[PDB]
Design a protein around this ligand. Structure first.
Ligand SMILES: Cc1cc2nc3c(=O)[nH]c(=O)nc-3n(C[C@H](O)[C@H](O)[C@H](O)COP(=O)(O)O)c2cc1C
Ligand code: F3S
Lengths: 1472, 153, 116
């Protein structure tokens, strides 16, 4: 995978450009898709200029005349299988080209050679042809391009008309030509020999190779698209297509004319997100806009709310935000019209892109600074790209445009400052709001009536509502909820309980909201949608809101502001309407809204005020869905807005669900009235009413921000009406007729059941007398509410059964667990065979099955050392595989004790935090695990309360004592599939014995990511469920995220076996595995290994208090104090007997089933049958979309291949073969080599051998040195032990010094390079990610997100970028140069020395937990003197020696940044 | 400049210090305040960064350093330059470098015009006496050879 | 301590054999037979009188304060057969390393090269 571009400044053709383009393309096989076949590819393309002389020569050979005007070439993919389609295709293209009078010059078949591509990629090979046409009317160039684009669109539509699949047009123009295909990158010049002529010369070229996530290729799905290239994936595509279909109705421009009618379906069907972006880009640029203009409009720059930027830039940003919704996410865009060449980033700068300028006026950019081989002394600039930045090359005038130059020149187009004032804000209306007509609240009786009308209990009024309005933040739960799903319960639940939230796995990364607040905005624009091609000031006359959720007074002010343009819709339906009254109500509102929109109305207010004894409230969610989808289908949503007034919104999840449908604003007036009436009753203290209201509003905004950041998107503007959710247990027809597009795996109730439930609740709430709100069972166990997973009888029975050491009591336990009402999906299934049982001693032995169980990870912070060690020893003594969990492990527990017990674990976790990974930590286990997303909290960071981290954990995680240590929600190393493949390669290089496992969470669409991660040399995919516990997580995340593991597992199995990859991995699941029936069902589904988890805790003594997040666990499990730890009661023999009983149960179950071993029932999913719940529920749940499976064939349905899949080794192996004396006698060594950018993670295996021989600190520093010349590879020196010293003469790519644990890396430019060592990048992004100790000395500038998760490293750099030193926990970072934005985000350990020049650092620092000062005490002066002395004597820099020479007065220019939590915990304090 | 790189020899510095002279390094004069007999010297201190990639340190001025020294009689020793030779000898064809010193061939030590040779300190610059004697002997050999040749031809 | 192996890797066998003992030939990965030195062929290496201190005297088991000169011949190779015999002995005392032979360029050295 990768994308790059080569451009020439002057603007003249030359063969050198294409030569260098091919050379660069031929050095990407390391990041590609390495597999076992050896010929299959994944898609590669190049895009260059048309060699007019070549085709002129061709047409001269044919027999015609050589024309003057530039010819036009068009490349087409025609059907090859049936010749009866070639005739029709030629027919269409010719009858639509000759429609204007253009002289067709001829056809041509490009030479090819199909002997080099694979076989699966060849059966889908289309026919490729080229048309050569000319101009006879002497038309200008711009009109030529316009006419060609219109012709292409019309041909595409006409071919769509005949339903002739397998037809495509690569590129049809006179300036550009694209050579793309489904072959391997390197073999390109062998597939298309046309590129080996001595006339194919251009002035610009763009190359790309994509990484196929699935193994079934498709030729038209390979970049570069029509006039665009791309890298990564867009987080929000399903939400942009709807808005595009909305804007379809108000687009027209005299640059097109009548033909505009043939351009309505701007976005086709089946094309990837990059294709849709490409097509809308082409449409927006074919009108007259320039490439940087449409770029700034599509992917805007993040609005930094600081005066540190020019004001015209801020006005342009406001305009570009107002005109079009953004398309955020990972993207390294490389666009080029016939005139400009533009390279750009996204809002956050997620993916890297670096460039360089030669002396010959040639710019070369891509993803690695070593893909091209150029003279090291013939360069003039090695630059990078920050977030939102862009570089431009103007070929028409031959000029380079950097970031600020381009932004200024583009702001010099139109007076953007004079138009941002044409709008109208809201603050001026709320300050001058009429303090009259205040409403009198209802009497308390009617308030309780209306609250009971929504099934709203009273425990929420103190559990999930009181902490929100009290302090200003959400609630937090401390155990995975195992309550039944919404469709199974009989008590009425809120309709929102059927919509689960979406999130993104390793495909697209999450984003932290607690630290990246500068990049997220919640603006709302009323009167916004307009013509997308117009350029005037009527587009910026509108109303702007700072939040979608509003109070009552603000809503009344806004309603009076809207004047006489408001419209109200009845959101209530008659109770005595009949069985189908809901359909009538929905039809009435649907016709009424469509009748009111045409009459002239412009703002539809949908309120539910009409609720009474004879009218029940329609679920506002369904009303919003219906009205929004109708306005979209009827080309009307652009004309109006949609404001909603709910009556049951109290949490942070309901508002997100409502906004995700298409609404704009929400004003829950019952919530405000309840807050007021609970405040006037005096239970909060002496806080004013408006202060509590403000804290409540802020809490809701922060909750919505978190729920938006969980998915990966950044702006609410591109989330409104996106359908980014998951439906479970609703009929397909309803969910597709009243919701835009949501995946529904299994069906469920329709309309009649919902009508029955709503009428039942309305009747039991209104027609009778209620005086007291019931308690309700929804969070913790209460007898009044619904069922639960861990009841008292069950837990006491299990504890007695494991204490008395008896089996019949365990049988009684299992029978009690089984005879319960249907609560989970796996209960509805029933086993069924055609065999007769066998004696119980004919099945496999007890050990033969007990060799398949494991326990999932548990944090060292949320547990006790005693309980952790007990679980570890219990899992080790049986012979199974234990766990270590996030949080490292005590080294002293690595070797056995005198009692004969191994107190070390078996599986190590490398989570988003990397809190304990060292040299030794990664070499004391047999398996690895990448904790991508936890079970209970998907896309969230590992939470841990502040006062629980004692001195022990603070010194074990290299942290500070007593501080809330939250793991980054993203992973900072897994941004796309190639990065995850790189990380797996590193983790397999560091330990040549173990294997690596990945942990995923079940949700729709996991099949693609499964088929992707399987090709990344993994061999175990552990699928977690949504019914798993945690240490501390917000209740909304546990209750409203994730799906049961059954669906995810049954999807992963089918997708892996469909692509013939099933025989290469292992599948293991966990979540709620309690008794043997569930284990055998999981084994039937396709899993092989199993995890238990919380049940094991019950075997230890846990009494299910669900108060672990306060450090007061009564049985002394999740306790960190002294008096409470002594209450421990457990014993490993308990776990022993528990596992033995489970094994015996599954043995007997399989015996009675008939088979003999487990290896024959895995995948035989026809043994399951679906039965009903009873003759009273009348639902239509069909689990059939799971019960199907794919017939494998030759390869089995399990892991037939023992041993891990090895990876190709780099030069470091040869290094080991030379450094024998270092392993046999212990003597110094000095080596040197020539490196390239295709050597991944150099010097890692040497570090492994060193730490295996001696230890973490067994060698004196500088023991062995290795000098590399030229550009190095990726992730240089990963996990180096003390003594190894890697010196480089050149520059590194990225991830340099990752996981350092004692190495000493020195990077410097060559001696023969005339470059300022402080104004050119020499390293990449995320330098020193999660390091632990060691020194690093750079001689250039770093990338973005530099020194993240640093713990004990001492780094010296002459530069930095965005989000430098984020969450720095310890160490030192000397920085000599300007920093980017958002410096030291949430830092709580270490010290930073910044060297400002213009004295502007206070304008960039994120002063949250750190203070900045001048250097005061001479001790710190001496420290900095020592550090810079070592830096200048190690790299022999020029700027370091310059600063050191004029040292007398230059110390006054230094700034010192120190966290606030260590002001009084240092031996030498800060101030005198 | 600095004492380490004074263009002269070090013995002279030590002897001048012994006799009783006072040294002030890294300075440059700018003005001489006075009416008819100079009374003071307004001068500014200077700074020298690290040497470049060639071996020639670059000077700069301090924006806050200004001083005045007592003055009664100022003696300038800024240096020396060669004269304008062409118009001095009514021979405007004398090929001269831009710096004022005249050109001469490397082999025979003969200038552009025949018969006339040129060697010594005027060719090089502010060289030493040993270089003077070297050039003198080389020019003597050149004159002898050329005169023998001219008498022969 | 610093990991410096001051030991050598190729041990010589001159015409004097001033330090050749049993072990001194068991601490190398290569032997050496110094037949004729480069600059002064057909002659024994000298050593002045005032340079031999006590250290070198104990190193060579000689008497301090005297000029050392090795005999020009090797006193063990008087023909090719005795050379083969000495190579056999040297290969048998060190069953790990290889042997070598150092000569000096002149006319007709091809024949003696083929012999060795
Ligand atoms: C108290 C507790 C702490 C946990 N800590 C971690 C953790 O640190 N890292 C992690 O990946 N999962 C952690 N988990 C989740 C487990 O690894 C596993 O996914 C979950 O417990 C499965 O739930 P189950 O026992 O119902 O099957 C924790 C779970 C609990 C209950
Ligand atoms: S179940 Fe958990 S909440 Fe405490 S009592 Fe046991 S650690």
């Amino acid at each position: 995978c990768g994308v790059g571009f080569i451009a020439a400044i002057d603007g003249k053709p030359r063969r050198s450009v294409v030569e260098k383009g091919i050379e660069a393309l031929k050095a990407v096989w390391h990041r590609g898709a390495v597999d076992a076949d050896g010929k299959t590819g994944d898609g590669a393309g190049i895009h260059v200029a048309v060699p007019q002389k070549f085709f002129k020569d061709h047409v001269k050979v044919i027999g015609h005349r050589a024309p003057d005007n530039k010819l036009a070439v068009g490349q087409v993919f025609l059907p090859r299988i049936s010749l009866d389609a070639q005739e029709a295709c030629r027919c269409i293209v010719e009858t639509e080209i000759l429609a204007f009078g253009y002289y067709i010059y001829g056809w041509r078949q490009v030479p090819i050679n199909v002997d080099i591509i694979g076989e699966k990629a060849n059966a889908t090979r289309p026919e490729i042809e080229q048309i050569i046409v000319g101009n006879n009317k002497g038309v200008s160039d711009e009109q030529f391009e316009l006419d060609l684009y219109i012709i292409r669109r019309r041909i595409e539509k006409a071919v769509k008309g005949e339903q002739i699949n397998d037809f495509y047009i690569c590129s049809l123009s006179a300036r550009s030509i694209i050579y793309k295909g489904m072959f391997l990158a390197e073999q390109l010049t062998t597939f298309y020999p046309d590129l080996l002529d001595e006339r194919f010369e251009s002035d610009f070229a763009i190359y790309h190779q994509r990484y196929s996530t699935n193994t079934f290729p498709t030729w038209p799905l390979a970049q570069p698209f029509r006039m665009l290239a791309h890298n990564g994936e867009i987080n929000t595509v399903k939400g942009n297509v709807n808005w595009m279909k909305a804007h379809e109705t108000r687009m027209e421009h005299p640059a097109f004319g009548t033909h505009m009618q043939d351009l309505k379906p701007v976005i086709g069907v089946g094309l990837s997100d990059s294709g849709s972006l490409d097509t809308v880009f082409e449409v927006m640029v074919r009108a007259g806009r320039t490439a940087p203009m449409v770029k700034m409009m599509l992917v805007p720059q993040a609005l930094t709310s600081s005066q540190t930027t020019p004001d015209n830039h801020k006005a342009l940003i406001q305009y570009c935000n107002s005109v079009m919704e953004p398309w955020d996410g990972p993207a390294a865009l490389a666009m080029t019209d016939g005139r400009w060449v533009v390279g750009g980033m996204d809002r956050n700068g997620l993916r890297p892109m670096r460039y360089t300028i030669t002396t010959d006026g040639l710019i070369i950019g891509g993803s690695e600074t070593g893909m091209v081989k150029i003279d090291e002394t013939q360069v003039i600039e090695k630059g990078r790209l920050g977030p939102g930045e862009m570089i431009a090359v103007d070929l028409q005038s031959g000029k380079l445009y950097r970031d600020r130059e381009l932004k200024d020149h583009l702001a010099t187009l139109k007076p953007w400052d004079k138009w941002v004032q044409n709008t109208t804000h809201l603050d001026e209306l709320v300050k001058t709001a009429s303090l009259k007509g205040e409403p009198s609240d209802m009497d308390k009786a009617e308030l309780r009536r209306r609250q009971q009308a929504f099934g709203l209990t009273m425990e929420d009024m103190e559990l999930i509502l009181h902490p929100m309005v009290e302090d200003g933040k959400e609630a937090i739960g401390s155990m995975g909820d195992d309550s039944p799903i919404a469709v199974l319960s009989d008590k009425y639940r809120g309709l929102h309980h059927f919509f689960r939230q979406n999130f993104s796995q390793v495909t697209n990364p999450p984003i932290d909201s607690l630290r990246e607040r500068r990049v997220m905005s919640l603006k709302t624009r009323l009167g916004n949608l307009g013509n997308i091609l117009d350029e005037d000031e009527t587009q910026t006359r509108l109303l702007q809101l700072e939040s979608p959720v509003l109070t009552t007074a603000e809503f009344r002010a806004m309603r009076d502001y809207m004047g006489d343009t408001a419209a109200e819709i009845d959101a209530t339906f008659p109770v005595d309407g009949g069985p189908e009254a809901l359909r009538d109500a929905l039809r009435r509102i649907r016709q009424e809204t469509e009748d009111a929109v045409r009459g002239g109305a412009t703002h539809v207010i949908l309120t539910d005020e009409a609720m009474g004894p004879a009218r029940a409230a329609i679920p506002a969610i369904l009303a919003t869905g219906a009205v929004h989808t109708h306005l979209i289908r009827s080309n009307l949503r652009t004309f109006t807005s949609l404001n909603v007034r709910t009556a049951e919104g109290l949490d942070t999840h309901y508002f997100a669900v409502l906004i995700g449908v298409g609404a704009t604003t929400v004003n829950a007036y019952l919530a405000q009235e309840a807050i007021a009436e609970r405040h006037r009753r005096g239970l909060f203290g002496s806080m004013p009413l408006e202060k509590g209201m403000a804290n409540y509003k802020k809490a809701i905004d922060d909750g919505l921000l978190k729920i938006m950041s969980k998915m990966g998107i950044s702006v609410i503007s591109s989330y409104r009406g996106g359908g980014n959710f998951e439906a479970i247990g609703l009929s397909r027809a309803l969910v597709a007729e009243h919701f835009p597009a949501m995946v529904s795996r299994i069906s469920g109730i329709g309309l009649n059941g919902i009508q029955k439930k709503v009428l039942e609740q309305h009747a039991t709430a209104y027609n009778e007398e209620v005086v007291a709100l019931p308690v309700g069972g929804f969070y913790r166990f209460r007898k009044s509410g619904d069922r639960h997973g861990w009841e008292g009888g069950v837990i006491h029975t299990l504890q007695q059964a494991v204490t008395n050491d008896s089996y019949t009591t365990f049988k009684k336990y299992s029978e009690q667990v089984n005879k319960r009402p249907p609560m989970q999906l796996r209960d509805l299934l029933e086993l069924r065979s055609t065999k007769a049982p066998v004696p119980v001693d004919e099945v496999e032995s007890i050990t033969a099955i007990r060799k398949r169980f494991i326990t999932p990870g548990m944090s060292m912070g949320a547990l006790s050392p005693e309980a952790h060690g007990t679980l570890n020893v219990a899992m080790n003594r049986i012979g199974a595989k234990s766990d270590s969990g996030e949080g490292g492990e005590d080294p002293a527990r690595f070797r056995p004790d005198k009692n004969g017990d191994n107190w070390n674990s078996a599986i190590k976790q490398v989570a988003s935090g990397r809190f304990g990974v060292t040299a030794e930590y990664l070499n004391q286990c047999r398996e690895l695990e990448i904790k991508v997303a936890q079970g209970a909290k998907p896309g969230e960071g590992g939470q841990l309360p502040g006062f629980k981290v004692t001195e022990m954990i603070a010194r074990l995680r290299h942290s500070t004592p007593g501080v809330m240590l939250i793991s980054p929600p993203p992973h900072h190393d897994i941004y796309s599939i190639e990065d995850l493949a790189q990380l797996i390669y590193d983790l397999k290089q560091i330990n040549p014995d173990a294997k690596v496992t990945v942990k995923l969470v079940s949700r729709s669409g996991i099949g693609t990511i499964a088929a992707g991660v399987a090709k990344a040399n993994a061999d175990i995919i552990l699928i977690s469920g949504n019914s798993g516990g945690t240490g501390a997580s917000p209740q909304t995340s546990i209750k409203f995220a994730g799906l049961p593991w059954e669906m995810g597992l049954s999807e992963v199995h089918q997708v892996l076996t469909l692509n013939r990859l099933r025989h290469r991995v292992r599948l293991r699941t966990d979540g709620g595995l309690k008794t043997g029936r569930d284990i055998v069902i999981a084994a039937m589904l396709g899993a092989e290994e199993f995890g238990i988890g919380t049940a094991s805790l019950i075997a230890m003594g846990c009494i299910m208090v669900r108060q672990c997040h306060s450090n007061t666990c009564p049985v002394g499990v999740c306790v960190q104090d002294d008096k409470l730890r002594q209450k421990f009661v457990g014993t490993p023999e308990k776990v022993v007997n528990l596992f033995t009983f489970l094994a015996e149960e599954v043995r007997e179950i399989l015996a009675g089933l008939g088979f003999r071993s487990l290896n024959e029932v895995i995948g035989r999913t026809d043994l399951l049958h679906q039965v009903s719940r009873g003759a009273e529920h009348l639902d239509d749940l069909d689990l059939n979309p799971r019960l199907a499976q794919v017939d494998p064939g030759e390869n089995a349905r399990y892991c037939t291949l023992q041993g891990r899949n090895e990876v190709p080794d780099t030069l470091d192996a040869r290094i080991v073969a030379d450094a024998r004396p270092l392993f046999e006698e212990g003597e110094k060594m000095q080596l040197a080599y020539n490196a390239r950018n295709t050597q991944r993670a150099i010097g890692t295996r040497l570090s492994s051998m060193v730490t295996r021989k001696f230890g973490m600190f067994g060698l004196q520093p500088g023991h062995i040195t290795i000098r590399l010349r030229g550009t190095a590879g990726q992730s240089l020196g990963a996990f180096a032990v003390q003594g190894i010293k890697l010196e480089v003469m050149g520059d590194a790519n990225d991830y340099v010094g990752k996981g350092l644990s004692g190495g000493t890396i020195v990077v410097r430019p060559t001696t023969s390079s005339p470059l300022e060592t402080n104004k050119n990048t020499i390293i990449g992004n995320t330098v020193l990610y999660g390091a632990t100790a060691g020194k690093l000395f750079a001689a250039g500038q770093a990338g973005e997100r530099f020194a993240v998760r640093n713990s004990g490293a001492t780094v010296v750099v002459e530069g930095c970028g965005s989000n430098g030193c984020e969450y720095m926990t310890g160490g030192t970072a000397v920085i000599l140069g300007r920093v980017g934005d958002n410096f030291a985000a949430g830092m709580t350990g270490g010290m930073a020395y910044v060297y400002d020049l213009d004295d502007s650092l206070p304008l960039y620092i994120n002063d949250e937990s750190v203070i900045f000062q001048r250097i005061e005490v001479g001790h710190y002066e001496s420290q900095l003197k020592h550090l810079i002395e070592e830096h200048v004597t190690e790299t022999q820099s020029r700027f370091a020696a310059e600063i050191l020479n004029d040292w007398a007065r230059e110390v006054t220019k230094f700034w010192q940044v120190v966290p606030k939590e260590m002001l009084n915990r240092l031996e030498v304090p800060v101030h005198l | 400049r600095d004492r380490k790189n004074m263009p002269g020899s070090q013995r002279e510095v030590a002897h001048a210090e012994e006799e009783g002279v006072e040294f002030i390094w890294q300075a440059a004069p700018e003005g001489f305040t006075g009416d008819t007999v100079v009374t003071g010297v307004r001068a500014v201190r200077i700074h020298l960064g690290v040497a470049d990639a060639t071996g020639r340190q670059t000077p700069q001025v301090i924006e806050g350093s200004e001083f005045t020294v007592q003055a009664d009689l100022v003696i300038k020793a800024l240096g020396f330059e060669p004269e304008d030779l062409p118009n001095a000898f009514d021979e405007p064809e004398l090929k001269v470098t831009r710096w004022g010193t005249l050109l001469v061939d490397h082999r025979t030590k003969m200038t552009n015009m025949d018969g006339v040779f040129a060697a010594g300190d005027i060719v090089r610059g502010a060289s030493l006496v040993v270089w003077a004697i070297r050039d003198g002997r080389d020019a003597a050999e050149g004159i002898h050879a050329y005169a023998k040749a001219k008498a022969e031809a």
